[PDB]
Design a binder for these strands. Sequence first.
RNA 1: UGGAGAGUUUGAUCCUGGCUCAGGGUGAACGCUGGCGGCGUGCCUAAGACAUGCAAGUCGUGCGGGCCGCGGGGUUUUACUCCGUGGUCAGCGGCGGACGGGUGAGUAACGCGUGGGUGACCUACCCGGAAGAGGGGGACAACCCGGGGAAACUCGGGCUAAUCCCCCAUGUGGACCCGCCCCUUGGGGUGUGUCCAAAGGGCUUUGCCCGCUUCCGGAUGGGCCCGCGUCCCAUCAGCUAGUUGGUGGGGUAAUGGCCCACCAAGGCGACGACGGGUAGCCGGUCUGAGAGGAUGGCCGGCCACAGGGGCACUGAGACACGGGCCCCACUCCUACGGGAGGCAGCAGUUAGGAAUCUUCCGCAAUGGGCGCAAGCCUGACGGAGCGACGCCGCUUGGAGGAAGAAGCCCUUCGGGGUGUAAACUCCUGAACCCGGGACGAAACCCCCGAGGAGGGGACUGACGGUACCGGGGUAAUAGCGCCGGCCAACUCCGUGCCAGCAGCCGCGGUAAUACGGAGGGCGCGAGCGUUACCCGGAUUCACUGGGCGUAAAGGGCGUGUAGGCGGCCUGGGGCGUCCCAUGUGAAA
Lengths: 84, 62, 208, 100, 50
Amino acid sequence: MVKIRLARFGSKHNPHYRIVVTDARRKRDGKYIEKIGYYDPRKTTPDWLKVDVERARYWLSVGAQPTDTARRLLRQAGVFRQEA
Amino acid sequence: AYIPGEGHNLQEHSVVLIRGGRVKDLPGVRYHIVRGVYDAAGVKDRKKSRSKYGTKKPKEAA
Amino acid sequence: GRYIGPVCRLCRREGVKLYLKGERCYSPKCAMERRPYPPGQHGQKRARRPSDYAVRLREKQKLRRIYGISERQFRNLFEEASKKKGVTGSVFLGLLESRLDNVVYRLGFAVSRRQARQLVRHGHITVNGRRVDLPSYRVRPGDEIAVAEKSRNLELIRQNLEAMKGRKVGPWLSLDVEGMKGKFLRLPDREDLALPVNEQLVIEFYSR
Amino acid sequence: PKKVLTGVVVSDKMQKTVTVLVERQFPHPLYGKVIKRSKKYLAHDPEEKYKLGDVVEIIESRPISKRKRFRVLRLVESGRMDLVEKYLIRRQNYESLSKR
Amino acid sequence: RNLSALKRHRQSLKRRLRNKAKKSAIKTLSKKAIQLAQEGKAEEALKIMR
RNA sequence: UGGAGAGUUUGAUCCUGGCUCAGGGUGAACGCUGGCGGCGUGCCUAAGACAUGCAAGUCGUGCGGGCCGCGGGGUUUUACUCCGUGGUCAGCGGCGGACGGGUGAGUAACGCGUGGGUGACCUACCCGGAAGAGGGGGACAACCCGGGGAAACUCGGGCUAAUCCCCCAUGUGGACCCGCCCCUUGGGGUGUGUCCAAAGGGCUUUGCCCGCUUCCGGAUGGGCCCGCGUCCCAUCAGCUAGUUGGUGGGGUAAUGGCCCACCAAGGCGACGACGGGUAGCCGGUCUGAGAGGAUGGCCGGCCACAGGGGCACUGAGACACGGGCCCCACUCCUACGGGAGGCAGCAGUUAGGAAUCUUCCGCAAUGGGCGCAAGCCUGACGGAGCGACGCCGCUUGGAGGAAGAAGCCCUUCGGGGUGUAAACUCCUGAACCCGGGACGAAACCCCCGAGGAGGGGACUGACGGUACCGGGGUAAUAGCGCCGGCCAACUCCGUGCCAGCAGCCGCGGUAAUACGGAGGGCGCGAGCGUUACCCGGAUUCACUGGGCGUAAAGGGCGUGUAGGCGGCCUGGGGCGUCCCAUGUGAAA
């Protein structure tokens, strides 16, 4: 089953993640089928809000799932949002 | 296997580490010795190549 | 590291004097005028000839000398300059001066190289607001090499200030002795803020 | 997309099966000059409605026999046996060199 | 020393007990199929098929 | 926009010509040296052996409970019977054990790199969909009683239920023999005769939540064919007996002789079959000027193997590292009858070698198994530590300061030099302590709307009082190699073909810049050298880029086989070709 997580790539201490979607089996560091953004909770610069909402709502409509702070991120960007 | 130069130390064994270099004789020459290891250690009187001619630091001390 | 010690004893080594140890190396001796020629018992014999590769080499070493650095970072950033798709050598020259140690030197706030480096290291200088320590710091067109608030309240710094007020800046790096600061601009070169060398010689020996 | 190739039918000597001999083109990586080599694909003829010489089109398929892949579509032409001629001539010349 | 390898082999046993029991039963019933069909009789061979 | 060479043959010369050094790179090793910091990296040798710690557990919204223990409900109480019951144990059952993980033994193979095939197919954990969810009962665990066993544990009768396990019904449907229409190698729709379902539990409660039963498609995983390319020895030249081919079966999630019967002889091969060696393949990686030589660790993927071979059973899927059968080999346990254990998963021990790391912390972040949720597992993971193993940041100091101290080296004794070097001065504040201190952490959950949006209360930090901010703050490690030519640096006693130097020519056969040392000097600096290994060079296996009249080298000549190159025009195909459009060329 295909899931979505956050993929840090920074140095020993450079908490800079690339927001990434791919499936469960594969590692946190391998081949990402997709991807679609990046996140930096440490806040070195307000660039850290990167989500691709289109393919997001699509890829959740097909059968993917978030995770912890991915549930978080999704509630941030506006992917969980719906403004009734 | 030869060594650096004048002034040996071994009796046998020594674990002499084959190195590798032909010079103008000994049809082969090759494969010199650490000088330090379990034997040799340069000699007792050299003021240069201690980087393989042994002797840590001569250090005048007094 | 940075040689250190018998410094401008090596000023007669080049055979040429330099703004190196500052005071005692400009006015009536860089350890010069007293005696200018390569140190050691062998200095004024009747010299021979340095081969092309050798003299060009010499030039390179002279470059690393006036800037006072290991050719480590130096050489590396040289090929880094070859990476930048413009005429390698000259572009390299601009991006060569650009290092803030001797930059702040010829900007005024330092008498000698040793000084400048020592100072910046101790967090005595802050470019564009942020106080750092890194002297090996290249700066972009538009920065602001301000000085620390206690470093303005220091003395020999003022000495360096007043022993300068009458010198035209390298036509870009304005001196603000109003509150001790320096405004950074553009990119000069070997024609704008020159020095007595031939660059492409160094370049030609460099990579063989 | 099931790949096909223009091949020259040989060996009717089998039951419901013919073996096509083909020759494909390619230059040379780092030298130049084109090349033309042996590759004999397996020609699936349901009732030996094809035979020697008669060049046809050959079609990649699913494994039908021991190594026998590929199949056969439309015929090309008859009155042949010339290419075949060259082929078996080469064969005998294979079996003309010895270490005995 | 242990590990839940116990569990899996136990239950693998169980489901194979049923598995092979019914499996062999059905093999034998298929023999029944070939005899009755070969003879030329249906109805009860048709029951076999049911 | 991307590139330099010399030395060595001779008396002398140019050419041919090989060997050698200038260079970059590497898991490095040692010798000299050695300090803080960062991000990486860090057994290649015996796929020898491996002791001790973690790797695989979880669910009580599936069920029967055994037990520690609790309010002790019932018992007016006795002894204790049993309703709640907190904590534990396993049993049935369900989910993962087929992922995470290691490492080259096997292997030159559609295995890999790679562009397509499946009208030859399977895929639970998510989506859209349609019909719904009844009836009977059976078996053994656990548990109840009793036996042996050093132990492994093993035995006989009785109980009990259940998302355990079947038998009839329900059929939108699936699938099948026979039929047909379109599609054209079993793809879709559809009739006539057939079979199957399902299972239900828990509450806030007559409505709700997790799960199911059938059925399809969609997302993925992958399976199996193919087009190409894919390492040395032809002194590996022929070779094959399921071997070429069929019908007909069996087989597998699916075609194929993969297993079987009969019958019929081809099958491949000089363009390299048969075989020995050799190696796991790729994105890549160092060089290169480019084309190329080399190789493939960390990081990313694919392939394969769990001591060694055969193996099935099981599940959706595996012949399954932490499962068992057999077997062989192999250590250890015992009351000697008999039993068990397996880290080429992460640390560590020994041997091997010149050589290569802690048997520590945290679940906080992410993250992987189950659960209605909190949560328990958590060597995936996040770090300290270590070695200069590498690169990037760096301190060991700044300032004036003589015709030049002394110490020393040289000298024709004139001094040159060491060396403003130092000493002496003015200087800042490394290291060191004091005050503070992170980010990484807002989720999940709870309250609110509905459990959908949004907002709001909130556990949550190992790393470590550490990056860092402030104060006081003190001048405080420098070492290696060369000094004949390729090379930049030479003066002095010693050494006398003796002692040594040695990448290549050579240096000492007593006036040695090449050997020792001294001085000064040159390259460098937590770095400096020495050796192993690939390549540019090297146009020296010559594609850009070669030679064979004497420098390596033209067949003993004829000869023609496969092969390659094809004289002048017209058209035809348009395979090779060219441009244009598009898929890929992942990430790093």
